[PDB]
Every structure is written in C-alpha cells, then in structure tokens.
Design a protein around this ligand. Sequence first.
Ligand SMILES: Nc1nc(=O)c2ncn([C@@H]3O[C@@H]4COP(=O)(O)O[C@H]5[C@@H](O)[C@H](n6cnc7c(N)ncnc76)O[C@@H]5COP(=O)(O)O[C@@H]3[C@@H]4O)c2[nH]1
Ligand SMILES: [Zn+2]
Length: 334
Amino acid sequence: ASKLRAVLEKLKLSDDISTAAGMVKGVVDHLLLRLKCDSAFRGVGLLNFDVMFKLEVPRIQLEEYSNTRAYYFVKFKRNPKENPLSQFLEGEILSASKMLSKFRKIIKEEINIMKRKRGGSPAVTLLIISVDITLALESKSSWPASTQEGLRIQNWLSAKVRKQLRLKPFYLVPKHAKEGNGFQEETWRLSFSHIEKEILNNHGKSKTCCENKEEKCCRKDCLKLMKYLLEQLKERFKDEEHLDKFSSYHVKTAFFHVCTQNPQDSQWDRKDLGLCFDNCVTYFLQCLRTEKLENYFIPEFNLFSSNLIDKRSKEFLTKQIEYERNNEFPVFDE
Ligand SMILES: Nc1nc(=O)c2ncn([C@@H]3O[C@@H]4COP(=O)(O)O[C@H]5[C@@H](O)[C@H](n6cnc7c(N)ncnc76)O[C@@H]5COP(=O)(O)O[C@@H]3[C@@H]4O)c2[nH]1
Ligand SMILES: [Zn+2]
C-alpha cells in the first residue's frame, strides 16, 4: 500500500494540464466553428486526449450488422428536403466511411498535423501532445436491444440511476466491424463514453462519496493503477506485439465489472487500497484466463473473444500480470 500510494503521487505531479486544458480547447472551439460552416456538419457540437463531436440525425433507422451486437447500419431515407447528408448515402445506408472521409478531410484542410491510427480507428488523431477527435452520430431514441442486459448498476448505483442513464442518448462512431479480410466500411459501432464518464465521476453508493474527508474511497485510484500497470507492461514489451491488442478500455471495462461486484463503498475504503487494487488485478486475470470480457453496456460483445485477441496474447499477459502480482508489482518501482 505504501508503494501503491507512491506511484499515485508519482502520477500526480503532472499543472501542465491547466495550461494544456486551455490549449486543446482553443483548437476544438476553432474546428467546431469551421465545421459548422460546411452544409453536412452544420449542427455539430461538443459532447459535454479523447474528444467526441456529436451530430444528431433525426429518425435514425438502425440495423444490427450480422450477429455482432455492437456494430450497426444506419438506414436513412434520402427524401428529407435539402439533405446535406445525401453525399454520404448508398441507397438507404448512411455510410460510416464516407462521413469519416469528409470529416477527416475538412479537419486536414484547416491549417492555422494528423496521422492515421491502426486499422479501424474511428477517430481523427491530431498531434501538436496528442488528441483524438471522433465523429459521433447522436440518437435520442431508446438504446438498442443488445444493451437490454448491459449497465448492471442496480445494486451499486440505483435502479433509479440506470433508468435515468438509459433515457439519455447513445452514440455511433465510424468504427467498422471486420469482415476478416478487411472491414465493412458502412457500419458504425455503439459508444456510451458519455455514460462511462458519468459513472466514473459519480461513482459511489453514497451520493456524497468523495465529497468529504469521511468518504474518500479509492475507486479512481484503483483504475489509475490498473491503467498504469497495462501502460507500463506495454512499454517494456513494446517490440513484443503480444500486448498491442490490449488497451486501457479493457482495463476500464474490467474495473466497471468489479464495481458491480463490490457495490458498497466500504468495499473501496482507502484504508484498503492494496486489497482493492488486488481485487481489480485478480478479476482482470480471470477475464484473460477465461477469455471473457463482456462490454459493460453490450453483454454479448466479448472484448476478449479469440476473434479479436488471440489466445497466445491473452496467456502472455496473464503470465506477466501473475508475475507482477507475485512479486509486489516490481514495475511500480522507481
Ligand atoms: N478515440 C477512440 N474512440 C473509440 O471509440 C475507439 N474504438 C477503437 N479505437 C481504436 O481503433 C483501433 C482498433 O481497435 P478495435 O476497434 O478493433 O478494438 C478496440 C475497441 O474494440 C475497444 N474499444 C476501445 N474504445 C472503445 C469504446 N469507447 N467503446 C467501445 N469499445 C472500445 O477496445 C479496443 C482497443 O481500443 P484502443 O486501443 O484504445 O484504440 C483503438 C484501436 O487502436 C478507438 N479510439
Ligand atoms: Zn468515492
């Protein structure tokens, strides 16, 4: 626990943000106005680095692509008078690739530097400090059926809170599902990143959790230490390529499942940081070992499927995390 707090303090040194928070916001506010000048993106807005540009399209018709519960076709009638989105249409299907092409195009045309990310990234990444800008369609309708059994927060947060969250919009990002050989350029993937950030900043059973010195839980610390553990092993195994499929979103997903398993705030008492971090570490090990990491909002989408991450990669990380646990986490030294 002394080492774990030493790492958190080592990760706390990074006031560079207060000046860099006003830096990236200047660029986002710029591209937010120039994009509003294009007919197709007049009506784009900031959702509430990883940035999300939302664009509400009324009466979006969704069609679950294949049997995957997360990727969808966006059906859209051409007829709506003066449609600025007709350039992205192919019959009834609203192409995710086409809209992302022109979205990337306009951003690149604004000079006042990008680099394509690995195959499938729905974002536009701008280096200056690194930024991620993702286009997202906004639907104010009910969440798709694949999310019916997701968001298992009833015993942690309230059932009251789940009903409120599921009344909020959901989003689709131009992340395409793979056809094995290549991708399906028309499909979008669901995104609940706005809900993800609500449950992280309002994370306790008590509404006043972390609002006073009596109720300082260590939930955020455990996720920080979980994210940092994966970041460090991936850096040491940089040229390994076995850890390239594992991202901090896997860690975040696993952390959410542990929160559902430990709903009480006394299970995250900061007097037990080492024990709470170990709960996160062991649950993530079972996920690798059983090859199962359900999406928190889409239960039947397995992030640890062999279709996405091979069995060799999962066991390789299992060996490394088991080592780090068995030796008081040496990667947290210095
Ligand atoms: N800024 C940003 N927002 C996204 O939603 C997103 N989704 C993917 N990516 C990047 O595209 C590439 C393709 O990975 P793939 O999609 O096949 O598996 C992805 C994806 O299935 C899943 N995932 C990541 N972010 C999300 C997310 N917000 N919602 C659901 N699933 C996600 O975890 C895997 C690894 O993600 P990252 O390694 O952090 O960056 C990925 C990756 O480099 C994203 N980048
Ligand atoms: Zn708390």
